[PDB]
Amino acid sequence: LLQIQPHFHVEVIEPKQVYLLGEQANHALTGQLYCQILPLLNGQYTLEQIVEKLDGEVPPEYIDYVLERLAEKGYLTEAAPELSSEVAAFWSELGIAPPVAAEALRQPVTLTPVGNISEVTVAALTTALRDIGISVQTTALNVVLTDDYLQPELAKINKQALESQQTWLLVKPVGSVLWLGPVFVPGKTGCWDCLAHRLRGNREVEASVLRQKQAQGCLPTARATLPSTLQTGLQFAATEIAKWIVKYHVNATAPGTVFFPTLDGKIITLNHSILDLKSHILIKRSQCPTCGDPKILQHRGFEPLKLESRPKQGHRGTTPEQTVQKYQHLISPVTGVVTELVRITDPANPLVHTYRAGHGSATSLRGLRNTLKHKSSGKGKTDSQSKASGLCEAVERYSGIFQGDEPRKRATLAELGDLAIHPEQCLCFSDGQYANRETLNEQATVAHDWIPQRFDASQAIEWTPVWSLTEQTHKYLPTALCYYHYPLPPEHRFARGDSNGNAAGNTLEEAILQGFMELVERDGVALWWYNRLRRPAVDLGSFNEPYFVQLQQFYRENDRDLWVLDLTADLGIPAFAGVSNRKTSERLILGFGAHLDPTIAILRAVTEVNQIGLELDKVPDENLKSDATDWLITEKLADHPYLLPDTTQPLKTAQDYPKRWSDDIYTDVMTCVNIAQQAGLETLVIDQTRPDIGLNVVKVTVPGMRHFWSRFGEGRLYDVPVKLGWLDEPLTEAQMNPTPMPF
Amino acid sequence: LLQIQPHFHVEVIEPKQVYLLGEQANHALTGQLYCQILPLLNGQYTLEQIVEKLDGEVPPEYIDYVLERLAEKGYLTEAAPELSSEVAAFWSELGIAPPVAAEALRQPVTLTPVGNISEVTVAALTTALRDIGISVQTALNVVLTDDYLQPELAKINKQALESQQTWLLVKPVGSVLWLGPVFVPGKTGCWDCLAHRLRGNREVEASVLRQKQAQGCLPTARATLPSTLQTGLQFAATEIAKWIVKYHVNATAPGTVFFPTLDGKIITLNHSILDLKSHILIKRSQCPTCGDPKILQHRGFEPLKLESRPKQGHRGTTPEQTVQKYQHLISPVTGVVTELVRITDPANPLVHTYRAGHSFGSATSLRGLRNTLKHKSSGKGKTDSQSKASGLCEAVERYSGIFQGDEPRKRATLAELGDLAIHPEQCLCFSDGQYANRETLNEQATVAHDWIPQRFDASQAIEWTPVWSLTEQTHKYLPTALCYYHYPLPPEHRFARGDSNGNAAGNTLEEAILQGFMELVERDGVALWWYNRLRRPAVDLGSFNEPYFVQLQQFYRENDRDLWVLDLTADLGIPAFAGVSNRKTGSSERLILGFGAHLDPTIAILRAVTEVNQIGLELDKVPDENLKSDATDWLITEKLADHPYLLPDTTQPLKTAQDYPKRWSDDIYTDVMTCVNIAQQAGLETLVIDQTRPDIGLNVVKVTVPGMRHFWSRFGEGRLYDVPVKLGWLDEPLTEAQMNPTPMPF
Amino acid sequence: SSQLAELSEEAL
Amino acid sequence: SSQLAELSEEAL
Ligand SMILES: Nc1ncnc2c1ncn2[C@@H]1O[C@H](COP(=O)(O)O)[C@@H](O)[C@H]1O
Ligand SMILES: Nc1ncnc2c1ncn2[C@@H]1O[C@H](COP(=O)(O)O)[C@@H](O)[C@H]1O
Ligand SMILES: [Ca+2]
Ligand SMILES: [Ca+2]
Ligand SMILES: [Ca+2]
Ligand SMILES: [Ca+2]
Ligand SMILES: [Zn+2]
Ligand SMILES: [Zn+2]
């Protein structure tokens, strides 16, 4: 039996047109013969029965040419008597012949309940499937129903499925948010552990409560269920099960040729409370310990660091808008690493662009409220550059969190000898600080200035291999520094990982450059702030960029002033600090930039000032809950002369900063490493890049360079200001700035 | 009796802390007394019972202070026995106490099918609703249809407005579920306010429906798995329950609960590809059924009233602020803009381009239908945000100008009106010889823009629309056919088709009138240049304090292209330019043109070269056979050797930044009044018709300065001949015969 | 042949 | 009292 595709309403307009009307597409047939034939391509009639309806009206040769012409064009298929007109219409709209869909639906399916899923609920799905021609067996697809995607049984199931080469589906039809998908195809899509890795990091409250509870497998919250939401989710499931059953059957007949989407490597969340559907992507983790090989990172840490030439087009290899498109898939509260990415830019203001990214273990409510506050901020001259900044800083953080597969080996400092680097070279805490450790921390405003316990060199700790660009060989730092949140014994907490010298980039050498510049940025500020030096302001008109002059004008209309000091030190790399107060609480803000190109450095500073200041500024002062609040409410520019420019010195200009960058990022990195080599500094890098993430992330460490946190150990903090003549004689530890750098 | 919010899962960290874990929210409680008490607040106990279990452990007076404090902050509830634990959880997670939620669901509901909806199907929804505790028979009437344009829905809508009945609309059949809106007579749009928009976005179905008249709606909801049907019906049941309830709880603890419903919203769930979009319904002020259709009529005959608008770059507000304010107009269902897409390779920061899907008119033939649908809008710009605003606002400009039938009109013959009326030939400027060979010319015409209408018959009383004359500060009259798109004229008197010439949108009327005036200046300047084939001087782009020009030049050079800018500034003296680009390599040169005019020559050149960008790059990757743009024959066949008036005049010097004097100001309004005086001493009247639509908000006008010229092949006596002579460009005027035989392709 | 030749099909 | 003073509730 023959028919035009069922999903089309056939409309014949007598002269020479016949319109094929679908719900999602429309077509048009022109030619008088179509008007005669198509009223009889409804599914009732055989090719043969047609003729008596029009023998002597049309010869059969003309008819065969029409059918063969309609057939190879994609409008003609044969009826399937097993399916209703409405069921057939559904599969034809997805481009699947009714007879094909019919033989595809014979394929049975298995259901497996897990968690606290009722036996009745399972029957309801069997029922929903039964009504659409799908039978259940007591296979090609194993559907798993759960009330939480971290139910520990799912591990065993996932393992068996991997060994069994079984395709399975996960669903959660209970609770206010239906979870639907993914379809796990072992060897093509990620495993459940690939998904679970992300879900554990994205549920910090539930994770800590487990830590607080165990210190004395998961926690189910899917209690909010209507009869309608449950049914909505089962039926929704049954429809996507059917779509996967068909897809599979056709790809055995002829791989490809089916281009409608299924939940393979995809998770759908439908929120019933607020009403929103979101599609999440599941990346197969190449270093997954279950479906993958988790030894990638351990190898790579010990392999030489291969760097090559990278062309350039503001000092990055590719646009920011590109970067976001290709790493957008990481923005997801389920499968993702960044929760959300939000503009706080008032679109009435084209100058100010700030994004807020979304974001951690804790063993107490106090420690827990500190987590969740942590969130990355996007800063830039352009909304697009700001958007990339916000997104990448979030991934910069995650990629550095210690997962347990990082490159290390256990040994004492003595065994390694010359290749190992004592952590006190990186931290630079003073013997005084270490001695009064317990008191100094109790009496500390913010926890950035946490003084760790002294390193004990008798102990065999885990050391990470790090690549020395200067010496072109592998050195070693304690793993506790090279990664965030590395767990150390309570008797020997000698370090916490810090964000200093950490950076991302579209390429490895892109990141190292920024990572190095992040180090220069901090070292400079430390010398200015803790010695309390007087520095010259920068003439922002001398620079060709007009953004500076327009931005200053903006701040003026908004009850503020703005100036930029020079912090460039013995390395001679353009460093700057932007400063701004309210001329009507003064609320002083600081921002810091460092780069070979001073115009970028000024820019880095000023944009960072906008990020911090103005967003806090619209809020009234008594309500503020930020970390650096006390400094914004109480402190005054009169009590900090080192913040305003030394009128005695001449204003800096564009001509006072020579150019040392090039057309290649790699070359600039080779320049930066030699600038540090003359200062007697070694440059070290660790590749923190996660394969499942893709975006390059490194930690650059140049031991001896100063952090702007209160670390008053002997070194460049006393010596460099003398070396350059900013001071006639070195300051003392007692003399250093007792007010910590508040940002 | 007593329990803690059922949706919360309780976990006690025994010394001090108690966590309340939820599906969407997590709360934490501190206090040794909470750890002692909360275990007993699971619905297993009454306040009378609690005290005895911890009698001698926690005072009775102390419990109340705790239970009081749990009430003020709403963590504490009393159990509703008419509800199950799972249901109570659903509403308590929405901030709704169980006993209140039970009272809400008592409000009854009626179901009414319409169209082909099965009586079986209705019963399925009834069963779904009862399962969640909603009785059926008021507070809500629910309507189940297969098509939102079923004629029967017209009559249901008018009773609801008379009865002030709040009702809901649903379409569960088909491969795309429609759900909503909830019409609230007086607070939201009516069905007709919605139906007006649906009729526009269904171009092929609307053009098929009339075409049948060569000899209500069409049902196209045939694809339905019994699961998608049940998926949609069950999903409806939830939203019905959420509406019933919120109406009850927003009066009984007003404030408190704030979650979205379907009032004025339509939800589309595409079962096939799996995509859920929300669509805002706007209440039309001019709606014939629930509003006043005499709004535009009254406004059109009232004096145009302008005011000062300082500038922030010659608009009053930023593009992103403009885009924000009008995003909701982007909906294939409820909106005017079907889609808005960035077609630009983000590898290139300089080139931006947007494609705004436009609904436009209706056709009565398969040949005419495909001319529509080809009708799309496009966004051009130096930046992304401005390229976006451009695409959006061009689409809305187009819609606004379409003749809805509520436009300010009146019947009269040209004689009854006097010198207040304006003969259409003043605007159209078709030559005597063109009218004479209409039929022949129109048939053997390469393009649809070249269409020569029948002569206007002054003896026929036509519809005239009032227009405001800025020069003369009074009303005049153009025939309505000129003022709006797709005005229906009798077959024996089709003297005009409404064109796009002078149409402009903007955040304010003065902003819009200004841009519209500049559209006329450019089409005029192009016309003079193109048809007289005048050799024009190029512009030295470097003399302007703008790097984007030289940056763009270099970019084109790397991509097998050159780029230059001809000056077309004519007798009005307003800077106007023509961007010209061509390919160096290939069988095709692919000449492309971009035009622009503005008081600020920088902006004027921007407008031109970004028009060259939007057309340019998108055709080049596309090979010759694949090309099916209107200017297709032009891009393959035509070489720069055939049109030497495209490349600049080596004889004249390069125009620089110093050559275009400043006549703009700090006020948009001043710039409008400046332009109208420029037209004045060129002996021209400036007319404005405000096409702005209340439902749209964005201002749209059509500026008309009769006698000014256009892109299109129209060779009447006027500025096309004389202005080149008045400027010294020609020593004597050309004849109609020596005009450019090749039409303006773009 | 005329009846057969004019048969055109296209999408909208 | 101290048992009544330390009573605290918050969202995270
Ligand atoms: N366009 C971009 N491409 C790649 N990484 C970026 C980009 N913009 C910023 N980042 C990274 O985002 C983080 C924050 O940047 P910034 O806010 O400029 O310090 C740093 O690790 C940068 O390297
Ligand atoms: N930022 C904006 N605000 C309001 N209208 C705009 C804006 N940008 C462009 N338009 C309008 O969009 C239409 C097309 O712009 P264009 O492509 O620049 O000719 C014109 O009616 C403009 O007035
Ligand atoms: Ca950083
Ligand atoms: Ca920074
Ligand atoms: Ca326009
Ligand atoms: Ca244009
Ligand atoms: Zn895995
Ligand atoms: Zn209405």
XYZ file of C-alpha atoms in Angstrom, chain B residues 165-543:
379
model
C -13.516 34.292 33.044
C -9.841 33.435 33.443
C -9.036 30.532 31.121
C -6.190 28.442 29.708
C -5.311 27.072 26.262
C -3.454 23.862 25.365
C -2.397 21.785 22.346
C -1.015 18.385 23.374
C -1.299 16.709 19.974
C 1.372 17.112 17.319
C 5.160 16.932 17.667
C 5.287 20.332 19.397
C 3.291 20.813 22.602
C 1.783 24.267 23.070
C 0.928 25.160 26.666
C -0.630 28.513 27.545
C -1.346 31.271 28.004
C -3.641 31.838 30.935
C -5.780 34.747 29.753
C -6.792 37.108 32.560
C -9.404 39.519 31.094
C -8.115 43.009 31.969
C -4.581 41.992 32.982
C -3.330 40.015 29.930
C -3.899 39.863 26.195
C -7.026 38.233 24.836
C -6.951 35.306 22.431
C -7.333 37.810 19.599
C -4.327 39.818 20.810
C -2.473 36.507 20.395
C -4.265 35.424 17.223
C -3.196 38.638 15.504
C 0.419 37.553 15.877
C -0.202 33.921 14.927
C -1.774 34.970 11.644
C 1.437 36.802 10.713
C 3.924 34.033 11.500
C 2.016 31.444 9.419
C 2.875 32.709 5.964
C 2.528 29.574 3.857
C -0.599 28.368 5.672
C -2.138 31.836 5.328
C -1.188 32.049 1.662
C -2.605 28.571 1.025
C -5.885 29.448 2.723
C -6.467 32.279 0.254
C -5.559 30.717 -3.056
C -8.332 28.302 -2.283
C -10.465 31.387 -3.006
C -9.161 31.133 -6.560
C -11.807 28.405 -6.778
C -10.785 29.153 9.117
C -7.471 27.365 9.718
C -5.643 24.215 8.615
C -4.950 21.357 11.050
C -1.321 20.207 10.951
C -1.052 18.217 14.175
C -0.857 14.604 13.029
C 2.369 13.310 14.626
C 1.420 12.030 18.084
C 2.794 9.103 20.013
C 0.344 8.239 22.755
C 3.306 9.133 25.034
C 3.828 12.683 23.733
C 0.098 13.189 24.189
C 0.242 11.913 27.761
C 3.503 13.831 28.253
C 1.739 17.031 27.255
C -1.497 16.407 29.129
C 0.268 15.492 32.362
C 2.557 18.476 31.995
C -0.562 20.659 31.614
C -2.070 19.207 34.771
C 0.964 20.385 36.770
C 0.807 23.962 35.448
C -2.939 24.112 36.016
C -2.317 23.101 39.629
C 0.416 25.699 39.968
C -1.878 28.459 38.667
C -4.856 27.462 40.875
C -2.585 27.511 43.895
C -0.604 30.723 43.347
C -3.851 32.637 42.788
C -4.793 31.391 46.267
C -1.464 31.990 48.023
C -0.766 35.463 46.576
C -3.792 36.375 48.685
C -3.161 34.605 52.009
C 0.453 35.502 52.750
C 0.889 37.923 49.838
C 4.508 38.215 48.798
C 6.079 35.031 50.226
C 5.821 32.726 47.185
C 7.181 33.984 43.870
C 7.297 31.349 41.116
C 6.320 31.721 37.446
C 3.035 30.528 35.909
C 1.468 30.743 32.421
C -0.223 34.142 32.688
C 0.589 35.905 29.417
C 3.157 33.239 28.531
C 3.132 30.428 25.980
C 5.362 27.355 26.353
C 6.436 25.302 23.348
C 8.053 21.914 23.890
C 9.364 20.359 20.685
C 9.173 16.577 21.193
C 11.199 15.859 18.029
C 14.434 17.757 18.664
C 13.779 18.370 22.355
C 13.728 22.142 22.805
C 11.678 24.210 25.243
C 11.104 27.910 24.609
C 8.999 30.460 26.472
C 7.002 33.150 24.650
C 5.593 36.397 26.118
C 2.110 37.479 25.027
C 1.686 41.259 24.861
C -1.686 42.869 25.466
C -2.410 45.024 22.432
C -3.852 48.424 23.343
C -5.386 48.691 19.891
C -6.871 45.195 20.027
C -10.353 45.315 18.480
C -11.728 42.752 20.938
C -10.388 43.850 24.381
C -8.890 47.283 23.589
C -9.604 50.362 21.456
C -9.034 49.990 17.695
C -9.374 53.764 17.207
C -5.977 54.594 18.723
C -3.917 55.037 15.562
C -6.811 56.767 13.792
C -6.922 59.415 16.517
C -3.131 59.710 16.788
C -2.575 59.974 13.034
C -4.722 63.111 12.840
C -3.064 64.729 15.870
C -0.059 67.065 15.582
C 3.326 65.366 15.742
C 4.914 66.453 19.016
C 8.696 66.308 19.308
C 11.087 67.160 22.124
C 14.774 67.453 23.023
C 16.867 64.276 23.109
C 20.493 64.641 24.194
C 22.953 62.065 22.799
C 25.200 59.418 24.355
C 27.164 57.338 18.967
C 24.308 59.621 17.895
C 21.495 57.697 19.595
C 19.983 58.353 23.016
C 20.717 54.904 24.480
C 23.136 52.028 23.936
C 22.355 49.089 21.661
C 22.433 46.485 24.451
C 19.927 48.619 26.354
C 17.821 48.709 23.185
C 18.224 44.959 22.655
C 17.316 44.233 26.295
C 14.155 46.317 26.079
C 12.864 44.421 23.004
C 14.161 40.830 23.232
C 10.646 39.542 23.939
C 9.649 40.520 20.409
C 11.795 37.568 19.309
C 9.428 34.593 19.165
C 8.192 32.531 16.224
C 4.864 32.231 18.035
C 4.016 35.361 20.021
C 6.636 37.646 18.522
C 7.375 39.720 15.445
C 10.958 38.515 14.990
C 11.153 34.807 14.174
C 14.827 34.233 14.891
C 17.918 36.397 15.516
C 21.209 34.690 14.695
C 24.889 35.622 14.601
C 26.065 34.339 11.202
C 29.574 35.744 11.794
C 32.697 33.675 12.170
C 33.817 34.824 15.640
C 37.371 34.282 14.394
C 36.992 37.726 12.840
C 36.503 40.512 15.402
C 35.919 43.186 12.743
C 33.029 41.684 10.771
C 29.656 41.349 12.492
C 26.360 40.351 10.890
C 22.963 39.158 12.120
C 20.057 37.515 10.314
C 16.642 38.436 11.679
C 13.851 36.147 10.490
C 10.968 38.244 9.253
C 7.303 37.244 8.791
C 6.164 39.971 6.370
C 3.207 39.809 3.960
C 1.016 37.162 2.384
C 0.985 35.965 -1.158
C -1.596 34.292 -3.376
C 0.637 32.166 -5.599
C 3.487 29.684 -5.312
C 5.673 32.127 -7.257
C 4.666 35.025 -5.031
C 4.999 32.972 -1.853
C 8.680 32.274 -2.458
C 9.325 35.998 -2.903
C 8.119 36.277 0.650
C 10.209 33.994 2.916
C 13.146 35.253 0.824
C 12.321 38.479 2.692
C 14.741 38.535 5.620
C 16.247 41.348 7.682
C 19.910 41.819 8.456
C 22.102 43.482 11.051
C 25.280 45.369 10.202
C 27.790 47.013 12.533
C 31.276 47.836 13.719
C 30.512 45.954 16.928
C 28.475 42.899 17.891
C 25.952 44.623 20.151
C 25.233 47.243 17.478
C 25.060 44.598 14.743
C 22.503 42.836 16.951
C 20.378 45.918 17.584
C 20.452 46.567 13.857
C 19.062 43.151 12.942
C 16.370 43.252 15.595
C 15.158 46.766 14.908
C 15.083 46.348 11.132
C 12.723 43.401 11.551
C 10.413 45.440 13.773
C 10.560 48.391 11.390
C 9.277 46.100 8.655
C 6.402 44.651 10.676
C 5.267 48.026 11.980
C 4.805 49.363 8.439
C 2.533 46.515 7.360
C -1.088 47.598 6.868
C -3.114 46.121 9.763
C -6.336 47.992 8.866
C -6.433 50.277 11.946
C -4.357 52.969 10.229
C -5.473 56.633 10.050
C -7.428 56.990 6.800
C -10.192 58.848 5.006
C -11.949 58.627 1.625
C -11.774 61.561 -0.800
C -10.786 62.433 -4.344
C -7.640 64.475 -4.943
C -9.870 67.487 -5.710
C -11.883 67.410 -2.459
C -8.621 67.722 -0.507
C -7.022 70.676 -2.297
C -3.324 71.609 -1.990
C -3.311 69.622 1.275
C -3.122 66.439 -0.831
C 0.010 65.240 -2.596
C -0.204 63.534 -5.972
C 1.519 60.109 -5.817
C 3.571 60.857 -8.959
C 5.530 63.420 -6.921
C 6.808 60.572 -4.771
C 7.006 57.738 -7.324
C 8.660 59.741 -10.130
C 7.912 57.295 -12.969
C 8.473 58.657 -16.461
C 5.679 59.177 -18.985
C 7.391 56.644 -21.258
C 7.528 54.034 -18.490
C 3.800 54.200 -17.744
C 3.158 53.899 -21.483
C 5.036 50.587 -21.805
C 4.152 49.281 -18.322
C 3.054 45.784 -19.236
C 5.895 45.101 -21.648
C 8.552 46.433 -19.296
C 7.163 44.678 -16.201
C 7.135 41.274 -17.907
C 10.675 41.467 -19.326
C 12.042 42.739 -16.015
C 14.863 40.997 -14.160
C 13.765 42.186 -10.714
C 10.618 42.737 -8.615
C 11.685 46.243 -7.511
C 11.365 47.575 -11.067
C 7.566 47.182 -10.991
C 5.787 50.043 -12.758
C 2.272 50.618 -11.379
C -0.821 51.789 -13.289
C -1.283 55.552 -13.568
C -3.129 57.131 -10.651
C -6.684 57.988 -11.650
C -7.507 61.313 -9.983
C -11.229 60.751 -10.580
C -11.320 57.805 -8.152
C -11.889 58.525 -4.470
C -9.067 56.629 -2.740
C -8.008 56.303 0.904
C -5.788 59.164 2.112
C -3.642 59.023 5.258
C -2.695 62.133 7.220
C 1.027 62.888 7.394
C 2.763 65.596 9.432
C 4.781 68.175 7.529
C 7.816 69.219 9.581
C 8.661 72.048 7.161
C 5.141 73.484 7.104
C 4.133 72.362 10.605
C 0.780 70.999 9.474
C -0.934 67.910 8.087
C -0.832 66.873 4.436
C -2.042 63.682 2.734
C -0.398 60.832 0.865
C -2.513 58.052 -0.602
C -2.601 55.248 1.979
C -1.086 52.805 -0.514
C 2.247 54.661 -0.273
C 2.412 54.899 3.501
C 2.137 51.236 4.527
C 3.265 47.848 3.199
C 0.722 45.630 1.451
C -2.263 47.952 1.165
C -4.907 46.096 -0.917
C -5.874 48.000 -4.092
C -8.493 47.131 -6.735
C -7.051 45.287 -9.792
C -8.100 48.164 -12.113
C -6.453 50.842 -9.937
C -3.173 49.491 -8.583
C -1.297 52.794 -8.652
C 1.244 51.897 -5.942
C 3.074 49.376 -3.766
C 4.346 50.655 -0.410
C 8.155 50.692 -0.501
C 10.818 50.665 2.231
C 12.200 54.075 1.337
C 12.442 56.379 4.351
C 11.327 53.791 6.915
C 13.241 53.773 10.214
C 12.979 52.569 13.809
C 14.513 54.142 16.918
C 14.276 54.454 20.693
C 12.556 57.831 20.241
C 10.519 59.443 17.449
C 13.167 62.074 16.768
C 15.847 59.387 16.681
C 13.734 57.538 14.122
C 12.853 60.558 11.970
C 16.546 61.433 11.766
C 17.669 58.000 10.573
C 14.771 57.856 8.126
C 15.779 61.159 6.562
C 19.291 59.820 6.040
C 17.933 56.752 4.233
C 16.426 59.118 1.675
C 19.695 61.033 1.273
C 21.607 57.851 0.450
C 19.107 56.425 -2.054
C 19.049 59.853 -3.694
C 22.837 60.108 -3.883
C 23.161 56.554 -5.177
C 20.474 57.201 -7.786
C 22.275 60.273 -9.133
C 25.576 58.414 -9.258
C 24.373 55.027 -10.502
C 22.104 56.122 -13.362
C 24.121 59.085 -14.635
C 27.156 56.830 -14.119
C 29.185 59.661 -12.606
C 32.851 59.067 -11.854
C 33.260 59.869 -8.150
C 36.319 60.638 -5.992
C 37.483 58.136 -3.363
C 37.951 58.869 0.332
C 41.295 58.778 2.147
C 40.189 56.555 5.019
C 43.395 57.236 6.952
C 42.643 60.952 7.341
